[PDB]
Design a protein around this ligand. Structure first.
Ligand SMILES: CC(=O)SCCNC(=O)CCNC(=O)[C@H](O)C(C)(C)COP(=O)(O)OP(=O)(O)OC[C@H]1O[C@@H](n2cnc3c(N)ncnc32)[C@H](O)[C@@H]1OP(=O)(O)O
Ligand SMILES: CC(C)(COP(=O)(O)OP(=O)(O)OC[C@H]1O[C@@H](n2cnc3c(N)ncnc32)[C@H](O)[C@@H]1OP(=O)(O)O)[C@@H](O)C(=O)NCCC(=O)NCCS
Ligand SMILES: O=C([O-])CC(=O)C(=O)O
Lengths: 434, 434
């Protein structure tokens, strides 16, 4: 009825047949070549794996189970007196493949408040983390340690059946998602609020609202932001470092805690989730070289000076997207409504006028348009969330929705250990010299 | 001369030229196909990535820089009054590509002893861990926390040129390797020695010698076993889950601590690094459900009764090996010297005669021969290392040599973000049509 696990149980066999048939027809269809450059170039262009929950077209950006970002904004339930879609609804869409009702989302909000409790060892561990240990490290470390509560771990130990794996994944996933805000808040409050307490969960709030509550914020429009932020960062194909990592570690039948932890270590990398900060540093240091109110003239110079001395315009470019990211567009549209005269935004805005002419002028690139991380920083900063180094953690909490949604399906569809073949250069040389 | 960092510095340019020359020759060449099966099958058979430290030809097993395990045992240096190759030596060979001298290995031992200090927050954190948190979660959790000491993560933030990456990676790598016995020992002693101290490092002993001193073992033979165990488990190509996670996570410019912690979460997965435990569970019952002394017909039947029951014979088969794993043989040889009349050994030896004959008959198994995990448990148990849960910590400490050797070279050769393209089922169906 409103029980996602019952709804999913009834979906899994249907999907299994469709897939089993599909491989019994076209298993041996070559879909791509592999060049030496692909092997040295990080599988660039390589169709490597199956990821069901979302798909990224290099022209119009991401689709969540078929639906674009605007479509999700319209259809997905909202909070009473809201206009941004709830992450709960997004998760439902990724798990079921179908847009949820108000009442399904409501029940999901209720389920995640119940399971939001932390074991004590985890609370102590966070309390005893120094202030020079990066937020993301604390996140990953804490999630790893949560694995002692894992149903899948003990289940597997007793010799549970393969047919039942997805069920324990599910429970572990619902528990992890529920507890993430709490972990993320504790970290945030220990690092930036003199260790004060996160308080209690409220069973009649949504996931996002409890999160902002535990953080210490009490702004409506912030909570709307969080809602949107968490939705649009949730998933981005299987090929991204953090999704690939969760998939890779998941395929060894590691439980959701270990898989997600690993994915966070992936997300923590500069070329992945840490781009959110990079942008805001480069934005502020820009507003240091110039004033805080640069026009277009000086602006055109600073861009070119960054692009002659041998540097990158941050939050611009992508590994497959070749147009403006719909995630950027979406964050921009939010700003046009709520904070249109913000100095930092209008700087962001001004770069969107100038940078996508000078990057496709100079060449030495492929995607001259912005990505999601070019925009998130200024939104957070507007609302008092000024601690750059915490920003990726917000990313982390969002991306759990997507990667856990996928992991449930991987273990229901019995995806096996990811285990490609590697080559040395030496060995590569002899191979081509057949 | 004896400074590994400087010798590495000399080799990097040459290796850069070689790969560039080779890419400037066969850059566009096709090395293999990508099928629908490989997509749902976890990149099986797919030539996924370049990995330099080791290569696993399915015929003759692992080679470290073109050297086999037997060659290494013969060529790599040993401890004064010893027979088993020092992992220091292995690490030297993977990083440089050359066999180290007596002197060169000696130096490496001192450098790792020099760097063995554990930050106090990690010591605290480890001591506050509960016993229902698995050894591997504690290892991974601790390694993440250690990234407060990452010179690379600081340097990167401060804006360092790419060409210097490798040098910071090298430093962090040496610290991580230097500190892993200290962590692994602290975990062992908290879990199995009522939380007693590990004891001091001795800067004149070897890595494996200090390790077992902190583990609190002082049978020469077990120190020798450790030495062998840490060498042979060191690396196994790029395509295994632990090496590949680190590769993948490393490619986002996450530091060696985050990369290795992620790899350990992959390694903690049942299908990757529990087979040693699984073997010894299945060997134990075999010596209760059947007599200790068993005929080779009774045993042979047991195997067939095993296969029919829908259960696998642990220790046998592999994802790409198609013959007796050299790491098995290596350990078999060690046992014939040091414990030939051990009952648990005589069984392992018995199964080596039988199990291969029956799996090929059945037909299913493409690799009817044993893997490393078949043999390690009985050697460990014999010396009083009977804590099965901990076994994977040993594996992990070993694998640090391989994955961090490679990580230095991935950053020195400027390998880019690993980022394949994924597809949904529904998306795949549309693709094969057009
Ligand atoms: C993943 C995310 O959402 S953000 C990742 C981090 N972002 C940043 O650092 C800001 C700019 N973005 C980047 O450079 C990104 O790492 C990427 C994904 C665009 C890199 O793209 P690649 O996969 O290398 O392919 P692409 O053909 O676009 O890049 C090749 C060249 O273009 C350059 N380039 C790419 N985007 C830009 C840009 N916006 N400005 C200047 N140069 C650029 C690269 O630096 C590279 O030059 P190099 O070979 O001398 O190093
Ligand atoms: C490692 C392992 C998972 C690799 O198998 P794989 O990559 O799936 O591929 P295979 O070619 O071996 O599989 C072919 C068939 O042989 C079976 N098989 C493989 N090894 C077997 C063994 N030791 N005993 C019985 N059956 C075996 C598989 O179950 C499979 O049956 P199916 O195709 O009808 O489902 C498998 O050999 C195994 O389970 N071994 C025992 C566990 C172990 O020691 N693992 C450590 C190394 S990772
Ligand atoms: O990095 C990638 O491959 C895609 C990405 O931006 C993301 O995951 O948010």
């Amino acid at each position: 009825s409103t029980n996602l696990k019952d709804i999913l149980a009834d979906l899994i066999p249907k999907e299994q047949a469709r897939i089993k048939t599909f491989r019994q027809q076209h298993g041996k269809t070559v879909v791509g070549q592999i060049t030496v450059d692909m092997m040295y170039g990080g599988m660039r262009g390589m169709k490597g794996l199956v990821y069901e929950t979302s798909v990224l077209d290099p022209d119009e950006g991401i689709r969540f189970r078929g639906f674009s970002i605007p479509e999700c904004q319209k259809l997905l339930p909202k909070a009473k007196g809201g206009e941004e879609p709830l992450p709960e609804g997004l998760f439902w869409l990724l798990v079921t493949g179908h847009i949820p009702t108000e009442e399904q989302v409501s029940w999901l909000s209720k389920e995640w408040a119940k399971r939001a409790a932390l074991p004590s060892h985890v609370v102590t561990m966070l309390d005893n983390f120094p202030t020079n240990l990066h937020p993301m490290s604390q996140l990953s470390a804490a999630v790893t340690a949560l694995n002692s509560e894992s149903n899948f771990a003990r289940a597997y130990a007793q010799g549970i059946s393969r047919t039942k794996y997805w069920e324990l994944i599910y429970e572990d996933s619902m528990d992890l998602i529920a507890k993430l805000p709490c972990v993320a808040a504790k970290i945030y409050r220990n690092l930036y609020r003199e260790g004060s307490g996160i308080g209690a969960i409220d069973s009649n709030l949504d996931w996002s609202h409890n999160f902002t509550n535990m953080l210490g914020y009490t702004d409506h429009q912030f909570t709307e932001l969080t809602r949107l932020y968490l939705t649009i960062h949730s998933d981005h194909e299987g090929g991204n470092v953090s999704a690939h990592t969760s998939h890779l570690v998941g395929s060894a039948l590691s439980d959701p805690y270990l898989s997600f932890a690993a994915a966070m270590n992936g997300l923590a990398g500069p070329l992945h989730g840490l781009a959110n900060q990079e942008v805001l540093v480069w934005l502020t240091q820009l507003q240091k070289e110039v004033g805080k109110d640069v026009s277009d003239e000086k602006l055109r110079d600073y861009i070119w000076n960054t692009l002659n001395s041998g540097r990158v315009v941050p939050g611009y470019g992508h590994a497959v997207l070749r147009k403006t990211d719909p995630r950027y567009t979406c964050q921009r549209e939010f700003a046009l409504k709520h904070l249109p005269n913000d100095p930092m935004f209008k700087l962001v805005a001004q770069l969107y006028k100038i940078v996508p002419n000078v990057l496709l002028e100079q060449g030495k690139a492929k995607n001259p348009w912005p990505n999601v991380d070019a925009h998130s920083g200024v939104l957070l900063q507007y609302y008092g969330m000024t601690e750059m180094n915490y920003y990726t953690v917000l990313f982390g909490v969002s991306r759990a929705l997507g990667v856990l949604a996928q992991l449930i399906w991987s273990r229901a569809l019995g995806f096996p250990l990811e285990r490609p073949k590697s080559m040395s250069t030496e060995g590569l040389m002899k191979f081509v010299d057949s």
